[PDB]
Each structure stands twice: as structure tokens, then as C-alpha cells.
Amino acid sequence: SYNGIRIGQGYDIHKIKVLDEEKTLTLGGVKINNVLVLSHSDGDIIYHSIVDSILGALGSLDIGTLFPKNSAIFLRYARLLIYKKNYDIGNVDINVIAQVPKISNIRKNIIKNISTVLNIDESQISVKGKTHEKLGVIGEKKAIECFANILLIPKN
Amino acid sequence: SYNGIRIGQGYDIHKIKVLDEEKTLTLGGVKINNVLVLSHSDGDIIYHSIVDSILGALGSLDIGTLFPKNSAIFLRYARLLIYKKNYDIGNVDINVIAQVPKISNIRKNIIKNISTVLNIDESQISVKGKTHEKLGVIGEKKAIECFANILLIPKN
Amino acid sequence: SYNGIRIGQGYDIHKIKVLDEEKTLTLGGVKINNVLVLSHSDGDIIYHSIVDSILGALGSLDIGTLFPKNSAIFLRYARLLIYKKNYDIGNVDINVIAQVPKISNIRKNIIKNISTVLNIDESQISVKGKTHEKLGVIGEKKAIECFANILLIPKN
Ligand SMILES: Nc1ccn([C@@H]2O[C@H](COP(=O)(O)OP(=O)(O)O)[C@@H](O)[C@H]2O)c(=O)n1
Ligand SMILES: Nc1ccn([C@@H]2O[C@H](COP(=O)(O)OP(=O)(O)O)[C@@H](O)[C@H]2O)c(=O)n1
Ligand SMILES: Nc1ccn([C@@H]2O[C@H](COP(=O)(O)OP(=O)(O)O)[C@@H](O)[C@H]2O)c(=O)n1
Ligand SMILES: [Cl-]
Ligand SMILES: [Cl-]
Ligand SMILES: [Cl-]
Ligand SMILES: [Cl-]
Ligand SMILES: [Cl-]
Ligand SMILES: [Cl-]
Ligand SMILES: [Cl-]
Ligand SMILES: [Cl-]
Ligand SMILES: [Cl-]
Ligand SMILES: [Zn+2]
Ligand SMILES: [Zn+2]
Ligand SMILES: [Zn+2]
Ligand SMILES: [Zn+2]
Ligand SMILES: [Zn+2]
Ligand SMILES: [Zn+2]
Numbered sequence: 194s195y196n197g198i199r200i201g202q203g204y205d206i207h208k209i210k211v212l213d214e215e216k217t218l219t220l221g222g223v224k225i226n227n228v229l230v231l232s233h234s235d236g237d238i239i240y241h242s243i244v245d246s247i248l249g250a251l252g253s254l255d256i257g258t259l260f261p262k263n264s265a266i267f268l269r270y271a272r273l274l275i276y277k278k279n280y281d282i283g284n285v286d287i288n289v290i291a292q293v294p295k296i297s298n299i300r301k302n303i304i305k306n307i308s309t310v311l312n313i314d315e316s317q318i319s320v321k322g323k324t325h326e327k328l329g330v331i332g333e334k335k336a337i338e339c340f341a342n343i344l345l346i347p348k349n
Numbered sequence: 350s351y352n353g354i355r356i357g358q359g360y361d362i363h364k365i366k367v368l369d370e371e372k373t374l375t376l377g378g379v380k381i382n383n384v385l386v387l388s389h390s391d392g393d394i395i396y397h398s399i400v401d402s403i404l405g406a407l408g409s410l411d412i413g414t415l416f417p418k419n420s421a422i423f424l425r426y427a428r429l430l431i432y433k434k435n436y437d438i439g440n441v442d443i444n445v446i447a448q449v450p451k452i453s454n455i456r457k458n459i460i461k462n463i464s465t466v467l468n469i470d471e472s473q474i475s476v477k478g479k480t481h482e483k484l485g486v487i488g489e490k491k492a493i494e495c496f497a498n499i500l501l502i503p504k505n
Numbered sequence: 506s507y508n509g510i511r512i513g514q515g516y517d518i519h520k521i522k523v524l525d526e527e528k529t530l531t532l533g534g535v536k537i538n539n540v541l542v543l544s545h546s547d548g549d550i551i552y553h554s555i556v557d558s559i560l561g562a563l564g565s566l567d568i569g570t571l572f573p574k575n576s577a578i579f580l581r582y583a584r585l586l587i588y589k590k591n592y593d594i595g596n597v598d599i600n601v602i603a604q605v606p607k608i609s610n611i612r613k614n615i616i617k618n619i620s621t622v623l624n625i626d627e628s629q630i631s632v633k634g635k636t637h638e639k640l641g642v643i644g645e646k647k648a649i650e651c652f653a654n655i656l657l658i659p660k661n
């Protein structure tokens with residue numbers, strides 16, 4: 194099998210409801226108290242997209258296929274999968290597309306959370322947010338989405 | 350010129366019509382009998398995005414520019430282009446965004462088809478599907494889209 | 506800190522108005538005389554996404570966070586950031602999603618501009634355009650978007 198450098202991209206989207214004037218969202222392990230997420234899961238697009246980026250990189254079946262609370266269970270599986278396949282994470286770059294919340298205000302916390310759950314250094318993690326210019330389903334605050342991009346580097 | 354590791358990302362989108370109650374789509378070389386694709390081409394977002402990921406990685410002009418049935422012709426061009434530029438494929442990770450069909454039900458076939466047409470091992474290929482939460486043009490089954498991410502590794 | 510190969514992905518979107526029958530857009534440093542961009546910035550999704558791909562790859566704060574004309578200022582920052590962190594650019598692959606303008610007609614100019622501002626060879630750059638099948642906000646010419654994908658390679 195292929196044991197060289199591997200690229201992965203994870204994608205996720207969840208429906209949200211912003212608590213304006215007319216379950217609580219979790220994002221990179223950080224509770225977002227002014228936004229509700231309409232999902233059976235915790236709605237954490239960052240954690241979910243990171244997991245699928247890792248699975249994708251290794252050619253494993255995705256979380257939905259493998260397993261038809263949970264975000265922590267999936268992140269620990271992914272961490273241990275990387276280890277048992279003799280890989281290290283190089284870096285991860287995460288793009289959140291969302292009107293709200295403001296990722297730059299919670300970046301440090303998200304990066305700390307990701308570093309802890311994956312057992313990597315904060316210097317290996319990037320998380321950035323961009324609005325959708327108030328256009329389309331994301332722009333009208335009906336949903337938020339995440340693209341997670343990762344490199345896995347073979348050990349020795 | 351640059352002869353080091355290369356990253357590529359391919360994107361494609363095609364209009365579809367799901368055969369519900371009020372040309373046949375091909376996806377990763379697999380016929381999808383309950384979905385029509387409204388395109389001049391075969392509508393195979395997976396094969397097309399894979400080709401453009403390879404061209405993109407190598408800095409070549411895209412399929413639309415190079416060549417203004419066909420999917421097989423383009424995939425063989427891409428395979429031979431990688432070879433003549435002294436590269437091997439590392440791995441490819443493919444993200445389909447679509448309400449239907451269910452990629453996990455046809456994953457094995459798609460992966461087998463990609464491995465055959467690119468002459469690589471199945472362990473170098475990932476294909477995953479995600480819905481769009483029934484929101485927007487993808488969510489309303491008006492279209493399907495694909496992001497293909499690839500690494501090309503120099504030979505010796 | 507991590508000093509190995511790094512992946513980055515930049516995303517950007519800007520609102521546009523096509524000058525049909527019932528500020529001027531800049532794209533990869535090329536003026537697009539038949540399209541207006543509705544932004545406080547120059548609206549250059551290519552340059553902006555390239556910058557954020559570089560920042561993302563290195564784990565730096567994004568342009569919006571770092572700096573709350575300008576596109577040239579940000580591209581020179583990114584170039585010098587790569588240098589001071591002891592990295593070289595491997596290659597960059599850029600995907601523009603837009604009905605208009607036609608990227609293939611201005612590809613050579615964009616690639617020349619990117620090579621000049623980043624001080625890299627044209628063989629390290631790919632830029633490709635795809636329509637959105639006249640569907641959604643992009644398809645209805647309300648916006649254009651860019652995904653920039655990059656590898657940074659450590660020096661020696
Ligand atoms: N076109 C599709 C859609 C979903 N699926 C599978 O269904 C699972 C869940 O789909 P979903 O879009 O509802 O995602 P979640 O709501 O679980 O986050 C995915 O992880 C895939 O395994 C697929 O294989 N192909
Ligand atoms: N903004 C755009 C749109 C299309 N194009 C070119 O037109 C070709 C076909 O465009 P399209 O969006 O109709 O894609 P297909 O329907 O051929 O899959 C692309 O491959 C590009 O070469 C471009 O260069 N810039
Ligand atoms: N969900 C979001 C949205 C914006 N932002 C920040 O706000 C800056 C500008 O956001 P924007 O979507 O208006 O992008 P521009 O119009 O500046 O191109 C971004 O670069 C981020 O630093 C964020 O951190 N999280
Ligand atoms: Cl949801
Ligand atoms: Cl988008
Ligand atoms: Cl969207
Ligand atoms: Cl189509
Ligand atoms: Cl999307
Ligand atoms: Cl879309
Ligand atoms: Cl804008
Ligand atoms: Cl899109
Ligand atoms: Cl969009
Ligand atoms: Zn999710
Ligand atoms: Zn968009
Ligand atoms: Zn196509
Ligand atoms: Zn979306
Ligand atoms: Zn911008
Ligand atoms: Zn789309």
C-alpha cells in the first residue's frame with residue numbers, strides 16, 4: 194500500500210438558527226451561546242470536517258459509513274487511526290464559511306481544543322473564518338460550513 | 350521548472366434531475382439509473398474533477414481550454430501527462446456534495462474504476478459523500494458537485 | 506514548532522455587478538472592464554485567497570485579523586512571511602468559480618502577475634475557472650469566488 198505523504202480534505206455543513214430578535218452550537222469544541230444548531234449531532238462542523246479530512250487522507254470510510262459524546266469519540270478514533278497507520282499530522286488549515294460567529298474572537302480556544310484532542314502543537318493548526326457576503330443559504334444565516342485541509346506525514 | 354511535490358484541487362458541478370414522482374448520470378464511472386444529468390457531457394463530476402486536479406497540480410491548461418467517450422479520453426490524457434512529467438500520484442481524496450445518490454453504496458465500484466483508469470492502488474483513493482442539508486441548489490437536487498484533492502510525488 | 510511541508514487553502518468571495526444591458530473588478534491583478542465589484546476592497550478574490558492560503562499554511566492570523574494599494578501590501582507581506590519562516594512555495598492551484606469573466610482568456614496575465622508578486626516561476630502556478638451552471642448566487646452573477654490551494658516546502 195501507499196505509505197507516502199497524504200492529503201485530506203473534509204467538508205461539513207449544519208443548519209443553524211441565530212438567536213436574534215425574531216441545541217446550542219458547538220464549534221471547534223467551543224460553545225456558541227447565541228446560535229442554535231438544528232442537527233441530531235452537536236453540529237460541530239470543525240471537529241467533523243477535521244475527522245473526515247483525516248479519514249479521507251488515509252482512504253478510510255467516512256464517519257457516516259463507519260458509525261451509522263460522539264464528536265470526541267470520532268476525534269479520538271481519528272487520532273488513534275493516524276497512529277496505528279504510522280503517520281503524524283503535518284499541519285491542518287481550516288476554513289469556516291459563516292456570517293456568525295466571529296471565528297477570530299474564538300480562534301485561540303479552538304486551536305487549543307484541536308491541539309489537545311489531536312495531541313499536536315498549536316503551530317500545526319490554522320483556523321480562519323469568512324462570511325458569504327450575506328448571499329445564499331450561508332449568507333442568510335441558514336447554515337454554516339467548514340473545509341478542513343490536512344497533510345499526513347509518514348513516521349521515520 | 351519546479352519538480353517537487355505538487356498539490357491539485359479540481360472542482361466540478363452538473364445540473365441533475367432526480368427521477369421521482371413528478372441523459373443518465375454517470376458518477377466515477379458508475380451509472381446512476383434514478384438520476385438524469387442535464388449536460389452536453391456525461392456529467393461525471395468525479396472523473397472531471399479528478400482530471401482538473403491533476404492538470405491543476407501540474408500547471409497545465411484545464412480540460413475546457415485544452416479540448417474546446419470524452420471522460421475516458423481525458424482521464425487517459427491525465428494519466429499519461431503525469432507519467433511524461435515524471436510524477437506518480439500520491440493519494441487522491443474526493444468530496445461529493447449531493448443529496449443523492451448515496452456514495453457509500455457505490456464507493457467500492459467508484460474506487461475500483463478510479464484505480465483502473467489511473468493505474469494506481471485502491472489504497473491511494475478516498476471518495477466520500479455529504480448532503481447539503483436540503484438547502485440551496487444542491488440541497489434542492491438541482492445540481493451535484495465534487496472537490497477532488499490530489500498530491501503528485503516526483504519519481505526517484 | 507513544525508518545520509515540515511505545509512498545506513494551505515484560501516477562500517474568498519465578492520459581490521459583483523456585470524455591466525450588461527440593465528468599482529471596477531480586479532482579478533489576479535488584471536482589470537475586468539465589464540464587471541463591477543461591490544466591496545470596500547479591490548475585490549480581487551485571487552490575490553486575497555492566495556494570501557490567506559499562505560497565512561493558513563503557516564498558522565498565521567488571516568489578513569482580516571492581522572490588518573483590521575492593500576492587495577499588493579498583503580501579497581508582499583505573505584511573500585516576506587514565507588521567506589522569514591524559511592519556506593519556499595512549492596506550487597499553487599487556484600480555482601475560480603464564476604460565470605464571468607472567462608479566466609482562460611486572461612490566464613497568462615494572471616499567472617504572470619502572480620509569479621511577479623510572489624517571486625516564483627510560472628510553472629509553479631495554475632489558475633482555472635468554472636461556471637456554476639447559472640444556478641445559485643454565483644450562477645446568477647451576484648458573486649464570484651476563489652479557492653487557492655498551496656504547498657509550502659521547507660528550505661534545505
Ligand atoms: N450523497 C451522499 C450523502 C450522504 N452519504 C452518507 O451519509 C452520511 C451522512 O450524510 P449527511 O449529509 O446527512 O451528513 P451528517 O448530517 O451525518 O453530518 C455521510 O457521512 C455519508 O457517509 C453519502 O455517502 N453520499
Ligand atoms: N469563469 C470561467 C468559466 C469557464 N471557463 C472555461 O470554460 C470551460 C467550461 O466551463 P463550464 O463552467 O461550462 O464547465 P463545463 O460545463 O464544460 O463542465 C472551463 O473548463 C474553463 O476552461 C473559464 O475559463 N472561466
Ligand atoms: N465567521 C467569520 C466571519 C468573518 N471573520 C473575520 O472578518 C474578516 C473579514 O470578513 P469578511 O467575510 O467580511 O471578508 P472581507 O469582506 O474582508 O473579504 C475575516 O478575514 C475574518 O478575520 C471571522 O473571523 N469569522
Ligand atoms: Cl444540520
Ligand atoms: Cl461557498
Ligand atoms: Cl453553500
Ligand atoms: Cl450540467
Ligand atoms: Cl457548498
Ligand atoms: Cl452550491
Ligand atoms: Cl464583496
Ligand atoms: Cl460552490
Ligand atoms: Cl456559493
Ligand atoms: Zn457534522
Ligand atoms: Zn459560496
Ligand atoms: Zn463536468
Ligand atoms: Zn454549501
Ligand atoms: Zn477579498
Ligand atoms: Zn456550488
